[PDB]
């Protein structure tokens, strides 16, 4: 007898399985994606933009900032101490 | 006016630094520095969800926060070798500590009543040693009013006057006689090495603030 007509119906597969969740995500994550993320830091500009470029960015944590940042604090004393003394 | 005043203006900039620049302009993937302020994060949320876990721990965990923090710049900063008295002008440091734990004992009085007195009956221990047992937990309660502060005070004064008592006594050392002044570095080393004690201590003692204000708040939010 004569065939049900379902094959030829199809209109909530589209909520039926779940990478439908994700391509409603990553069609707007993706089509407004950029190829490259904008910055790692870059401000503290007066001379020091470059002071934070050499030490504080993403390049690398040594211990150059540290013993540069404990400098300026012994100079404020140490200088004081002569004004102390 | 202060120099002191000066001092305190300068651990808020530094702070500012550790989520101003520190940061990589809030970068997901994370840098070696902002790594560092991860951890830190980590090892307070799992310690204040630890401690003052319950319907309420996130509500507290900013205060536990800049807890750590402020303490944790302040026992580097006073380890600098010039560089003020902050944690060595105890009365600062033992004020706050009183301050916190009144703020405990009125939020607890607040939150929980005149059962609030309740937390200084311990247990349903046998009738003929309950009064005692209540005037030794108010007497023990008001103990922690002032054991928070000393502890953080006195480990950081200790330190200071220790180093610097050792390095008038090496000085006196090194100006005596040559045959003194051969033999002049060992006592140095010393020195040395109590001040990468010194460090140590400050900030495992800028962990134990941290979490006795938190033990002190586990035991004012949930009764007993």
């Known amino acids: 007898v004569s ?12 909520i039926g399985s779940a990478p439908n969740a994700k391509r409603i995500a990553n069609v707007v994550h993706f089509y407004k994606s950029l190829p490259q993320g904008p910055a790692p830091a870059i401000k503290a500009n007066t001379r020091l933009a470059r002071y934070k470029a050499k030490y504080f960015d993403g390049d690398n ?3 150059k900032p540290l013993w540069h ?9 140490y200088s004081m101490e002569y004004y102390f003394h | 006016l202060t120099t002191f005043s000066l001092y305190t203006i300068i651990v808020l900039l530094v702070i500012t630094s550790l989520y101003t620049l520190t940061n990589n302009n809030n970068k997901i993937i994370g840098s070696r ?5 991860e ?8 310690m204040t969800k630890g401690q003052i876990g319950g319907k309420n721990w996130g509500l507290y965990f900013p205060m536990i926060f800049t807890l750590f923090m402020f303490i944790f710049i302040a026992n580097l900063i006073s380890m600098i070798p010039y560089s003020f008295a902050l944690s060595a ?3 600062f440091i033992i004020s706050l500590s009183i ?15 005149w059962v609030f007195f309740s937390l200084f009956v311990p247990a349903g221990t046998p009738l003929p040693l309950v009064p005692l047992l209540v005037i030794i937990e108010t007497l023990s309660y008001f103990a922690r009013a002032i054991s928070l502060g000393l502890r953080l005070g006195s480990n950081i004064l200790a330190g200071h006057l220790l180093m610097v008592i050792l390095a008038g006594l090496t000085f ?11 033999f002049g570095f060992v006592p140095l080393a010393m020195i040395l090495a109590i001040m990468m004690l010194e460090f140590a201590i400050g900030i495992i003692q800028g962990y134990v603030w941290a979490i006795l204000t938190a033990s002190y708040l586990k035991d004012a939010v949930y009764l007993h």
Do not use: E, R
């Not at chain 1, 404990?70 to 004393?77: E, N, P």
């Not at chain 2, 520095?33 to 302020?37: E, N, V, Y």
């Open chain 1, 69 to 77: 940042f404990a400098l300026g604090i012994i100079a404020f004393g």
């Open chain 2, 172 to 182: 006196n050392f090194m100006l005596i006689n040559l045959f003194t002044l051969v």
């Open chain 2, 39 to 46: 951890a830190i994060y980590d090892t307070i949320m799992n």
């Open chain 1, 3 to 14: 065939t049900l007509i379902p094959p030829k119906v199809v209109s909530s597969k589209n």
């Open chain 2, 99 to 113: 301050v916190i734990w009144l703020g405990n004992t009125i939020l607890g009085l607040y939150k929980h009543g």
């Open chain 2, 33 to 37: 520095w902002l790594i560092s302020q």
């Open chain 2, 89 to 91: 002008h105890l009365v």
């Open chain 1, 61 to 63: 944590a040594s211990g």
